[PDB]
Homo-oligomer: A and B are copies of this chain.
Amino acid sequence: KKMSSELFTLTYGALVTQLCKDYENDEDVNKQLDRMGYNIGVRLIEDFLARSNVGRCHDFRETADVIAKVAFKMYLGITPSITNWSPAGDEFSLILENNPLVDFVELPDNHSALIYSNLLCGVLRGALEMVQMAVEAKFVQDTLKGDGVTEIRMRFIRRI
């Protein structure tokens, strides 16, 4: 059954806090969050494929639509918009007006290099690798850093 995001967001917060304690270095935390996200994505994809009707596909644009309109809604309760497609159609952006994971959070002094929700990039990359799609996911905008929106840039590297 569906649930609100508050407990999830606070739990993610505990994770970030623990990593900051474990490494005392924002860059290390960013790296670990992405790694964990990757491992999560490799597992999460099995659940998604079982609960969706995409079957076996490899189309990048279809993948963008499914990620934004189905996966994000299913696992985070939000529907980001798909924007800025590259001429080649191998790059696009996910625009989030609101990011549940940053609720109740206030990025402190000197923590500017920290990419708080970096876990999501790993999830996207790990999940897509399992469907034979090598991609690059990265944050280019973050409301926690004063930006108007949160933006995840997606780039298709090659088929695996």
Query: Is the beta-carbon distance between B6 and A47 smaller than 8 angstroms?
Result: yes
Query: Given that A1-B78, A43-B104 are known contacts, is A8 also in contact with B11, CB under 8 Å in the complex?
Result: yes
Query: Is the beta-carbon distance between B7 and A4 smaller than 8 angstroms?
Result: no
Residues on B with beta carbons closer than 8 Å to the beta carbon of A5: 3
- Tell me if A's interface is mostly helix, strand, loop or mixed: helix
Residues on B with beta carbons closer than 8 Å to the beta carbon of A18: 15, 18-19, 22, 32, 36
Partner of A39, one of B2, B14, B78: B14
Residues on B with beta carbons closer than 8 Å to the beta carbon of A36: 11, 14, 17-18
Stretch at the interface among A68-76, A84-92, A136-144, A152-160: A68-76
Query: Given that A15-B15, A18-B19, A19-B18 are known contacts, is A43 also in contact with B10, CB under 8 Å in the complex?
Result: yes
A1-B77, A11-B12 given; 15 more Cβ-contact pairs under 8 Å = A2-B2, A3-B4, A3-B73, A3-B76, A3-B77, A6-B47, A7-B40, A7-B76, A7-B123, A8-B8, A11-B36, A14-B36, A14-B40, A18-B18, A18-B22
Within the complex, the shortest CB–CB distance from A115 to chain B, in Å, comes to 16
Partner of A3, one of B22, B74, B119: B74
Within the complex, the shortest CB–CB distance from A80 to chain B, in Å, comes to 12
Q: Which 9 A-B pairs have the closest CB atoms?
A: A2-B2, A1-B77, A3-B77, A7-B75, A8-B8, A14-B36, A10-B40, A15-B15, A6-B47
